[PDB]
Amino acid sequence: MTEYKLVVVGAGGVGKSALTIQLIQNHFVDEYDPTIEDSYRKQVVIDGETCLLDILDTAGQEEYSAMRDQYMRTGEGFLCVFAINNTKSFEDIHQYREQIKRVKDSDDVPMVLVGNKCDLAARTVESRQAQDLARSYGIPYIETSAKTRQGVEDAFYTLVREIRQH
Amino acid sequence: GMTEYKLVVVGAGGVGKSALTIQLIQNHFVDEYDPTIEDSYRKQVVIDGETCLLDILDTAGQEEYSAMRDQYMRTGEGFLCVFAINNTKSFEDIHQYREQIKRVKDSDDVPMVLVGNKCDLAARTVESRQAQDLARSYGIPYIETSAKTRQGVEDAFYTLVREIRQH
Amino acid sequence: QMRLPSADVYRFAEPDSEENIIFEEGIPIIKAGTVIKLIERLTYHMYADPNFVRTFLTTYRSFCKPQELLSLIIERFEIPEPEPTEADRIAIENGDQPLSAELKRFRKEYIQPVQLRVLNVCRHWVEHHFYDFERDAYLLQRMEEFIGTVRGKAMKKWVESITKIIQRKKIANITFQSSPPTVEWHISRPGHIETFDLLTLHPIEIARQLTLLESDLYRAVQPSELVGSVWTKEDKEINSPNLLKMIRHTTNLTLWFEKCIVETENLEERVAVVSRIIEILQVFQELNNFNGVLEVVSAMNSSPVYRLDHTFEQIPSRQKKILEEAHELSEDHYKKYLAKLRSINPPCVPFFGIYLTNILKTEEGNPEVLKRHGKELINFSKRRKVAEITGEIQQYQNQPYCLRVESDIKRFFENLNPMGNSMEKEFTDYLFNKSLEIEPRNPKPLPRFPKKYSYPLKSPGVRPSNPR
Numbered sequence: 001m002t003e004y005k006l007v008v009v010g011a012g013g014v015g016k017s018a019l020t021i022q023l024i025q026n027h028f029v030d031e032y033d034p035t036i037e038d039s040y041r042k043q044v045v046i047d048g049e050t051c052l053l054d055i056l057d058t059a060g061q062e063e064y065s066a067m068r069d070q071y072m073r074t075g076e077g078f079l080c081v082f083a084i085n086n087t088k089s090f091e092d093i094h095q096y097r098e099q100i101k102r103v104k105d106s107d108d109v110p111m112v113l114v115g116n117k118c119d120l121a122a123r124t125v126e127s128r129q130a131q132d133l134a135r136s137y138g139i140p141y142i143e144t145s146a147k148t149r150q151g152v153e154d155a156f157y158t159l160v161r162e163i164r165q166h
Numbered sequence: 167g168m169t170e171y172k173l174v175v176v177g178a179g180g181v182g183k184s185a186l187t188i189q190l191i192q193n194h195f196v197d198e199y200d201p202t203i204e205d206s207y208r209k210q211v212v213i214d215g216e217t218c219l220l221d222i223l224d225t226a227g228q229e230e231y232s233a234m235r236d237q238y239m240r241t242g243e244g245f246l247c248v249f250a251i252n253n254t255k256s257f258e259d260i261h262q263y264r265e266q267i268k269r270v271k272d273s274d275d276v277p278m279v280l281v282g283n284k285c286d287l288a289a290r291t292v293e294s295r296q297a298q299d300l301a302r303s304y305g306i307p308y309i310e311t312s313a314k315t316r317q318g319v320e321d322a323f324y325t326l327v328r329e330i331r332q333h
Numbered sequence: 334q335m336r337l338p339s340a341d342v343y344r345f346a347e348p349d350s351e352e353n354i355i356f357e358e359g360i361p362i363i364k365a366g367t368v369i370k371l372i373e374r375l376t377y378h379m380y381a382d383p384n385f386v387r388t389f390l391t392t393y394r395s396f397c398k399p400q401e402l403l404s405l406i407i408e409r410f411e412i413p414e415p416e417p418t419e420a421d422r423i424a425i426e427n428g429d430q431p432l433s434a435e436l437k438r439f440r441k442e443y444i445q446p447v448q449l450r451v452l453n454v455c456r457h458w459v460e461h462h463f464y465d466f467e468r469d470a471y472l473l474q475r476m477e478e479f480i481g482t483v484r485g486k487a488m489k490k491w492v493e494s495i496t497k498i499i500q501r502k503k504i505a506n507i508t509f510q511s512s513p514p515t516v517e518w519h520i521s522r523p524g525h526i527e528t529f530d531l532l533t534l535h536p537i538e539i540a541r542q543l544t545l546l547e548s549d550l551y552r553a554v555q556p557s558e559l560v561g562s563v564w565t566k567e568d569k570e571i572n573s574p575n576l577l578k579m580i581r582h583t584t585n586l587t588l589w590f591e592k593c594i595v596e597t598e599n600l601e602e603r604v605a606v607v608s609r610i611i612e613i614l615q616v617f618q619e620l621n622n623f624n625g626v627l628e629v630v631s632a633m634n635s636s637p638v639y640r641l642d643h644t645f646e647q648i649p650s651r652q653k654k655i656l657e658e659a660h661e662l663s664e665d666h667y668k669k670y671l672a673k674l675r676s677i678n679p680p681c682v683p684f685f686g687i688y689l690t691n692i693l694k695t696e697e698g699n700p701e702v703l704k705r706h707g708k709e710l711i712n713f714s715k716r717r718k719v720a721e722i723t724g725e726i727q728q729y730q731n732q733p734y735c736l737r738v739e740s741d742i743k744r745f746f747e748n749l750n751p752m753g754n755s756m757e758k759e760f761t762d763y764l765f766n767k768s769l770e771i772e773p774r775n776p777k778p779l780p781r782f783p784k785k786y787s788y789p790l791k792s793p794g795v796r797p798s799n800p801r
């Protein structure tokens with residue numbers, strides 16, 4: 001089985017950990033416990049092929065911003081997560097995208113743009129806006145809810161597919 | 167090609183049983199082991215001039231799965247019945263192991279060896295004379311081994327192969 | 334490259350040498366080291382390796398006491414800051430604000446990463462290895478004090494978080510993805526627990542409820558029950574109670590299958606019993622319940638059952654095939670089982686026995702220390718091997734089954750006690766004697782026996798039904 005190194009990045013509190021734990025354990029985490037760095041493994045069959053996913057769950061808090069280079073080097077693919085009820089987190093995406101390109105010295109890095117918390121009505125980032133950004137990056141845009149599971153498998157397994165064809 | 171013998175190690179858990187097969191398969195000069203890889207329980211050896219292949223089943227650690235014993239034993243042509251010389255209970259267990267082997271193989275004459283294993287520097291509680299008498303009463307060889315120094319390990323396995331050859 | 338504090342005031346700044354650390358031949362893999370070097374690398378400033386954190390916290394007790402680990406990581410946390418440099422000195426002497434470029438860099442690239450990584454060790458320790466604290470209240474007090482008195486705005490978010498996490502842990506929901514299938518019923522109807530039995534429950538629902546039970550038992554086993562091979566030692570009931578409960582369920586189910594078979598003296602009825610058990614095996618296979626599969630295989634290869642040639646003869650060839658394929662999983666040291674486990678889509682229930690043997694042999698077959706240049710180094714590669722096994726175990730413990738619990742059927746199998754008040758040897762001898770009775774050794778001819786079941790023997794089959 002092929003092993004895939006996935007890395008989940010984005011501003012603090014957007015739901016990177018909730019997304020990952022929903023995928024791993026089918027459980028929604030209600031608490032907000034800021035991550036430093038967590039690792040998860042998942043054996044899963046995608047498009048009829050058994051995969052081993054290593055998922056690195058990273059820190060969004062700005063106080064940890066000097067330690068990003070370190071995990072960006074190892075990652076094969078990146079979930080760039082913002083929250084659709086948080087405009088600042090959307091504006092933060094651009095910085096993650098550029099740092100990843102910088103670190104891996106490539107314009108061709110497997111990536112998925114993720115708009116999380118789509119279960120909430122109070123949206124402030126419009127889908128069209130995020131979609132335009134994704135297109136400018138050449139990557140898919142998927143809206144998710146770690147709470148309901150909407151889009152969660154789609155987001156992660158779409159990233160796997162991009163690594164696969166890379 | 168060569169003859170392959172299916173050997174099965176049985177005996178009480180928690181008293182160093184696994185050291186026997188590890189010491190045999192191991193690279194004799196580097197104390198190291200990865201049970202996870204194939205070739206960790208297969209070994210080509212020359213015994214009395216004749217080259218053969220040893221396949222050793224040692225399910226050490228699985229002793230609590232007592233209903234699986236028959237299935238594991240069924241696979242074997244020869245058996246090492248192992249007890250620790252500082253654990254009287256493990257010695258007392260031997261009779262039931264032998265009875266179980268006989269039943270599974272449906273035979274009163276199964277190739278087997280009795281092995282008394284020294285797994286630490288604690289005081290011996292089973293005398294070699296006790297174990298010799300028991301082995302004699304069964305009509306089988308008795309071999310004593312050390313779990314640290316590799317003493318007796320080759321003798322235990324080679325003797326069992328001779329028991330199979332002469333069955 | 335950053336200058337470090339002197340090794341005399343901060344021990345974790347000793348240079349790497351082969352006298353204190355050895356690497357395996359994009360981060361290094363440690364073969365061996367002193368505790369100091371292991372802890373430095375556990376919290377290294379240059380890179381993250383959360384898997385190292387899990388490996389270390391799972392296995393460290395074989396070379397370091399929990400109280401000592403806490404002292405060492407607190408020591409690691411307390412990093413001295415450098416004094417102002419010559420350029421800084423000159424600025425200060427002229428009444429200007431120093432650039433403090435080197436101090437700022439050291440804070441940003443050494444101190445903050447190392448301190449955050451110490452805090453991540455504390456976090457993982459508390460979240461995933463809380464038993465150290467459960468078994469030693471004073472260790473917990475020390476941790477609470479340490480975390481509770483970390484000052485500075487940089488660590489503040491995580492310090493407050495870890496304080497809350499500890500408090501939560503001291504006083505201590507699944508989403509799918511589709512609804513579970515409808516519970517299936519056969520002769521026994523809902524609530525009629527008195528009638529529950531191998532043939533009267535639906536074979537589909539027997540397999541499902543046993544899979545839920547066996548999955549819960551599998552998922553409950555902690556690494557603390559495994560490291561140091563403690564399930565094999567004198568205090569195994571104290572240290573490995575979940576593992577042993579899981580194994581005893583497996584053993585009891587296997588013995589129940591054997592009992593159901595040999596206590597069915599009539600050949601025709603016994604064929605129906607065996608055929609129903611193989612049907613349950615088929616559903617275990619569909620559910621990736623490998624423990625359940627091997628439960629059945631173990632029963633069919635047992636001395637009392639294996640020798641029942643007349644029963645075997647009448648089992649449909651398609652069921653013979655299913656059983657033989659299941660058995661082939663275990664052949665050649667579980668070669669096909671291992672390949673199958675690594676290929677399926679979870680949820681599954683692994684066979685635990687293989688893990689136990691590999692953990693035991695890894696621990697017994699490798700030395701605790703490596704001796705190099707007159708020094709004793711901790712053999713960390715041995716611990717990494719053990720942690721790879723516990724890590725694989727944990728990976729299969731994550732995925733839950735989408736199946737509805739049936740409380741009465743669950744209880745029926747929880748309370749299954751085929752041995753009754755009998756000891757193992759006498760029950761085991763009993764089973765084999767029953768076997769001899771119902772199918773005597775050659776050349777004794779086969780006797781006939783009366784039927785015992787008053788209800789239909791025809792199976793409802795193992796394909797699920799679905800009303801609107």
Ligand SMILES: Nc1nc2c(ncn2[C@@H]2O[C@H](COP(=O)(O)OP(=O)(O)NP(=O)(O)O)[C@@H](O)[C@H]2O)c(=O)[nH]1
Pocket residue numbers: 010011012013014015016017018019029030031032033034035036058059060061116117118119120144145146147148
């Ligand atoms: N309604 C809703 N709440 C969500 C969702 N995802 C996360 N949350 C909530 O948002 C908060 C932050 O979640 P978390 O996963 O910790 O975010 P994070 O990105 O990992 N934070 P950090 O960067 O500090 O580790 C939590 O209270 C969580 O329950 C979602 O899809 N819907």
Ligand SMILES: Fc1ccc(Nc2c3c(nc4cc(Cl)ccc24)CCCC3)cc1Cl
Pocket residue numbers: 607630633634638639640641642644645648653656657660
């Ligand atoms: F109902 C039965 C009663 C006894 C057996 N015993 C078995 C036999 C053979 N192979 C087996 C293989 C497995 Cl896995 C399990 C059992 C077997 C071939 C030699 C005759 C018997 C099998 C069934 Cl189905």
Ligand SMILES: [Mg+2]
Pocket residue numbers: 016017018033034035057058059060
């Ligand atoms: Mg997080």
